[PDB]
């Protein structure tokens, strides 16, 4: 067995990490005090869940997690929340003042003063691992910590663990929840500086999940708790194969082998169905065919964009619940005749499927109804570039007048790092157009 370390950086990273580890505990049966009745090997193991948990002599099951915020208010609620007994105090790390929505303040100024401590607390977990596979990093593109400190942590992790895999879960900025006018700036900076250091990154656009919470959960004004509980379902599907017995995506090297033929093009689109309200009085349960079909509807993707006008490089179906292979291939056969699904020439049109018979778990009293079968699709479409174009264009609008640049320079950045980061993004858009169009 091989261990995985999760790193949660910033407000978005931490709060989403709350929702995930809560969901994990509910799924592996681990109660808030760290106990896991169904674990009979007291105080040790190399079961599949042990990829995400270590064990104490007292039988406590401990997340292989590191939480990091430049300011303490958020990681404090974890220190005093329902799962306090879950974490070792030294896994929760906080500073004094935050990056004030400023990449450079998170990367250069305030980041440089806490990086070595964070690497030290992470080392303390790598030494508890017989064969560590790598890291899963949760952060926003838009916050100053989320973008600037993360890109600095990602630079040093490549140095200290050159042989390890690094996956990202990245909250892409949406105006109807956003925090700062400068998030497009932070977004491009931290992409430019983290690209070479990441193997695979899953972009969750806050706009997509926000509309899903409204359209499909009939929530007028969705909260971070709503957003984050839905995001935790999608991450749980993506990570189920690291924590459970199976043969698809069993280690972090398989995510990039199975989903990333090109190193730079390592942003797979995620689609999830079904999202059903807990207060839907009458609900007809959907079928294998109906939920596999919903995987090709843009209104279900973690990023809005039109996969019909791009090309596929890989497609991965991940089911949870009452699914057998035969219903899956009768669904695919139907869908293939009705939908435009074009792969790139140098790659095989087809699907990789994984099924876990346990149906999805829901936080008791949350907003998601329990379902008998659900699916998450991971596809590498060139269509996701639509989201880089949106973000690069907003960056071009402000930077053409140098709006807000002085906040970055005043922390030590040169103006050239902006145009360097934007020329890297302009190449990234050019790559996607290569693979994708004729």
């Amino acid at each position: 067995m091989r261990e995985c370390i999760s790193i949660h950086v910033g407000q978005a990273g931490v709060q989403i990490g709350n929702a995930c580890w809560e969901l994990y505990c509910l799924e592996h049966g681990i109660q808030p005090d760290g106990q896991m009745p169904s674990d009979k090997t007291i105080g040790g193991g190399d079961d599949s869940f042990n990829t995400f948990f270590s064990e104490t002599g007292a039988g406590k099951h401990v997340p292989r997690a590191v939480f990091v915020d430049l300011e303490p208010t958020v990681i404090d609620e974890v220190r005093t929340g329902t799962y306090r007994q879950l974490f070792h105090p030294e896994q929760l790390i906080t500073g004094k003042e935050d990056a004030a929505n400023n990449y450079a303040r998170g990367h250069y100024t305030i980041g440089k003063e806490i990086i070595d401590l964070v690497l030290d607390r992470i080392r303390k977990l790598a030494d508890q691992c017989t064969g560590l596979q790598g890291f899963l990093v949760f952060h926003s593109f838009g916050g100053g910590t989320g973008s600037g400190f993360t890109s600095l942590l990602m630079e040093r992790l490549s140095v200290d663990y050159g042989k390890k895999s690094k996956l990202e879960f990245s909250i892409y900025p949406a105006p109807q929840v956003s925090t700062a006018v400068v998030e497009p700036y932070n977004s491009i900076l931290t992409t430019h500086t983290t690209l070479e250091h990441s193997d695979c990154a899953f972009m969750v656009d806050n706009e997509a999940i926000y509309d899903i919470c409204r359209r499909n959960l009939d929530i007028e004004r969705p909260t971070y708790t709503n957003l984050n509980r839905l995001i935790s379902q999608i991450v749980s599907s993506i990570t189920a194969s690291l924590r459970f017995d199976g043969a698809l995506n069993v280690d972090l090297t398989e995510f990039q082998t199975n989903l990333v033929p090109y190193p730079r093009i390592h942003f797979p689109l995620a689609t999830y169905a079904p999202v059903i309200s807990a207060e839907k009085a009458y609900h007809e349960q959907l079928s294998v065919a109906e939920i596999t079909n919903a995987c090709f509807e843009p209104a279900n993707q973690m990023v809005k964009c039109d996969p019909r006008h791009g090309k596929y490089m890989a497609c991965c179906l991940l089911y949870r619940g009452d699914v057998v292979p035969k219903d899956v291939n009768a669904a695919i056969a139907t869908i293939k005749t009705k939908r435009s699904i074009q792969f790139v020439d140098w790659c095989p049109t087809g699907f990789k499927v994984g099924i876990n018979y346990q149906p999805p778990t829901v936080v008791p009293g949350g907003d998601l109804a329990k379902v008998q079968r659900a699916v998450c699709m991971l596809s590498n479409t060139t269509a996701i570039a639509e989201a880089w174009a949106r973000l690069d264009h907003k960056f071009d609008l402000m930077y053409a007048k140098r709006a807000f640049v002085h906040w970055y320079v005043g922390e030590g950045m040169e103006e050239g790092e902006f145009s360097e980061a934007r020329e890297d993004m302009a190449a990234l858009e050019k790559d996607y157009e290569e693979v994708g169009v004729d």
Partner: protein, 62 residues
Amino acid sequence: MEVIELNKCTSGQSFEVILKPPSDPSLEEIQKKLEAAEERRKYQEAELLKHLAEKREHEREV
């Protein structure tokens, strides 16, 4: 439409269905850049204390 590499176990199954086949910077360099930025700060801060010292002298002269 061919199925492949089918794997079973108590938790579920996995398989592959085909429809058609085909036709790092070093710690020293980080240090350097992380410190060329601090120098650029301290320079800017030093310009500030310089302009402020001039203002003290004008204050005295008036």
